[PDB]
Structure 1
Amino acid sequence: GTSKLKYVLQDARFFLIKSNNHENVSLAKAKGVWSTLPVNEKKLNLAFRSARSVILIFSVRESGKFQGFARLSSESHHGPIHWVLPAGMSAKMLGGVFKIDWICRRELPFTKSAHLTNPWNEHKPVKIGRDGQEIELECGTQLCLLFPPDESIDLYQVIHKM
């Protein structure tokens, strides 16, 4: 069913996350963590205090798909995730580490979200946006509901953290 999923997304905020490679999304799925650059880290920390749920929707650059979505369970904290960093991306260049609970680990191709435009990015298709781009509530909710159901996930424990 979709009822607990809809409850988790109620009055949520949504942010597009762009990962340079698949390895870091795989690590995030395995370890329940994410890190971003300080400009986006500040935005997510503000949002985490401000909303019942902050949802990160992940897309690997050039993949043509989203790889799933997750809910922040903490603000960022410091003090060492073995991110696969491209040349020019330093471990210190990143911010802290956010803990996340995956809501859906399944893929969604961009072809299936072509009817969804993001008011906060000039009504461009929701697939379009820089890392950290906020997605307006209605568009973000509909995008999350397009993903295939992930039957491996039990949202009972996530609801209790709200």
Structure 2
Amino acid sequence: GTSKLKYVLQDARFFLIKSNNHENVSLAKAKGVWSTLPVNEKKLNLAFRSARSVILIFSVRESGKFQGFARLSSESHHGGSPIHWVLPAGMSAKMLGGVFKIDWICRRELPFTKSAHLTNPWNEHKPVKIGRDGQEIELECGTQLCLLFPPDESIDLYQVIHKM
């Protein structure tokens, strides 16, 4: 079913994550963490305080797909055991030093061809696949985008609901 998923997405905020490589999304799925540039770090920390759920929706650049979506379970935190991110050019380890814990809600992919009917009012009504890393996605668009993903039957949202 989809009722707990809908409950998690109730009045959530949604942010588009654009990764320059597959390796870091695979690491994020394995280790339950994400890091972003300081300008986005600040926005996510603020939104983590503001809403029942903050949802990250991941797309690897040039893949033509989303790779899944996850819910922030913490604010960012610096200085722990370093995450072995593959660093994009011009991106240093210090720039990505803030670590967010995340709980994955869906690790299945969705091709851009299936979201062509969803546009994001916070990005000039462009198709929701279009956007820079950290672009916020409006509530209705974000909800519908998440509901388009194939079910991930490996996930139990019972614990995530307890964190809300």
How do residues 1-162 of structure 1 correspond to structure 2 at under 5 angstroms? 1-78=1-78, 80-162=82-164
Q: Percent identity?
A: 99
> Deviation digits for residues 23-68 of structure 1, max 9, x if unmatched?
0000000000000000000000000000000000000001000000
Spell out, residue by residue over 1:65-122, the C-alpha distance to the aligned partner (whole angstroms, 9 max, x if none): 0000000000000160000113322101224100000000000000000000000000
Mapped to 1, the partners of 2:43 and 2:56 lie a distance apart of 12
Q: Distance in 2 between matches of 1:90 and 1:52?
A: 32
Give the secondary-structure state (helix, strand or coil) at the position aligned to 1:67. Answer: strand
RMSD: 0.8
Structure 2 distance, partners of 1:134, 1:91, is: 24
Single out whichever of 23-32 and 77-86 deviates more from structure 2: 77-86
TM-score by length of 1: 0.98
Q: For 2:23 and 2:37, how far apart are their aligned partners in 1?
A: 17
Q: How many residues align?
A: 162
The residue matched to 1:48 in structure 2 has which SS?
helix
SS at match of 1:56: strand
C-alpha distance in 2, partners of 1:113/1:17?
16
**Cα distance in 2 between the residues matched to 1:88 and 1:99:** 24
Contact 1:70 1:103 in 2 (8 A): yes
Deviation at 1:17, TM superposition (A): 0.1
* 1:41–1:95 CA contact under 8 A, matched in 2: no
